[PDB]
Write a protein that binds this DNA or RNA. Sequence first.
DNA 1: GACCCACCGGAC
DNA 2: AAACGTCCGGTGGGTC
Length: 539
Amino acid sequence: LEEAPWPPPEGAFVGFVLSRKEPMWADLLALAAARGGRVHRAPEPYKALRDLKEARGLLAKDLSVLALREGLGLPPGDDPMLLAYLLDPSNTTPEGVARRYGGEWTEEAGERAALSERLFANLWGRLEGEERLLWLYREVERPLSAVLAHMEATGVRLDVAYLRALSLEVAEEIARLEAEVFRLAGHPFNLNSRDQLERVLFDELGLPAIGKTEKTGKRSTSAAVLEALREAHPIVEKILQYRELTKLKSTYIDPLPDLIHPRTGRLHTRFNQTATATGRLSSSDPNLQNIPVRTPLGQRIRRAFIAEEGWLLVALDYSQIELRVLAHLSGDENLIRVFQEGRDIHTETASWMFGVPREAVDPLMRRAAKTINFGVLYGMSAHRLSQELAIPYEEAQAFIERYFQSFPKVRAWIEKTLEEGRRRGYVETLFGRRRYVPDLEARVKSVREAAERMAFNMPVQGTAADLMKLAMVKLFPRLEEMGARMLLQVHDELVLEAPKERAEAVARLAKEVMEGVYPLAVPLEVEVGIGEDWLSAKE
DNA sequence: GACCCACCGGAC
DNA sequence: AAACGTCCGGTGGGTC
Ligand SMILES: Nc1nc2c(ncn2[C@H]2C[C@H](O)[C@@H](COP(=O)(O)NP(=O)(O)OP(=O)(O)O)O2)c(=O)[nH]1
Ligand SMILES: [Mn+2]
Ligand SMILES: [Mn+2]
């Protein structure tokens, strides 16, 4: 490209280099723009940001986030990564997209700007005629990038002193459990090393090996194996407790307080828009979509996510979302009637699992039933189900039979989806988002059947993702006009932050927007709560 | 110091 | 572990 002086003309493609991948923490090392066969390189990147009207190019959202961090309203526009991701969601990184559609991802701003230009032209042309993918781009993914940039730059408040105190308490309990393990083993070793633990459990203590690991064939020490051995030796129960506490301390309690940003005083995740095979978002650096919630200690961690003073958190979460989606996609009359009658299949599975009235189901029980319902739906074996429910093999196989007998149109939909996936090579969501699954025709059965479970999961999970994304796009301008913030997305859940005096109005409105995002053959119901902390808002 | 591999486990 | 799916991250073990 011919070099031309900064600034670039309006509408040019942007290229940029960060000192590190996280835009909230990155130094902007270089900034360039390309257009009309010309490349423009900025003498001072920070100053030159003020010249741009929007971020148009590869990884546009990251540049927009850094602009917001600097107090600049620079919205993200076109991003050929989003085009590539709609054509094939295995298009997840710039390195791969470049090597597929006509360029090379380097470390220089100007080359990245020129690459963004050539890649947009090529990919936009590949979408000519793909009307449904173009609708998803214009109506969901491109506007969604702007919502996500604002969420990333806003962040979430964390009770740091709380988590600091909690680390010290959890350490004390870890030390006691460790001493108990070493004593029950008769000697110390590195309880964090699964190799050392394997030798101690299965060679020294002679416990029976339940299963083996995939690539190296070691005797597994997974929670499931230990669950199976929970009564075969008292040490197992203690190892299960040690694993729980060390997992939560090392992954959440200790690292999260060290990620507070100095200028915002808040914690900033990244919402990756081209990272999953189904159209879900992902979250990283840190992942705020897998914050603990299940166990009592997990709940204490979740309580550390709090509202700014004078604000409240609002948490909203679709009810039984993939089951409602399945009802719509399959057309099963029986499953539809379940939701038109206000029934709860997680509660009903819970009542059967634990043999208690629906009134007696607690959150820990409902979660367990949740895993059963989706485990069975997406192809869990009677063998594993027998082990999860702790019932005879026969009684687990009888549950899988009843489950699908209740909704006969579902297996019919599974087979039509797989058959169409074999013919077309891809499966698709309600909105036409595609996932290519060529192993539906694999000649090795185990491989093929794994591909089948991925293939008919995708329309259900991806439709639910499409609906959530569309709701975010519709809800975001309403929130800005009410003075409220969108903070987090957790797949079928939003966490908002609102002025105390407006929290109730925001909760009501967000619930309506979410439930009415796109009418299906069943109603979408959204559970909403308000609190000073993430856990209390979910109650 | 950066990176990889395998496994293990958090959430939805 | 096992014929649930989708992700990301810590640890040990290892290399360069
Ligand atoms: N395959 C699979 N999908 C899962 C699993 N857990 C969650 N999902 C998928 C399927 C779920 O529909 C979706 C959202 O998860 P939630 O909000 O935690 N549960 P839901 O919406 O069903 O029930 P309610 O909100 O009334 O508590 O994530 C699982 O173990 N397996
Ligand atoms: Mn839900
Ligand atoms: Mn949820």
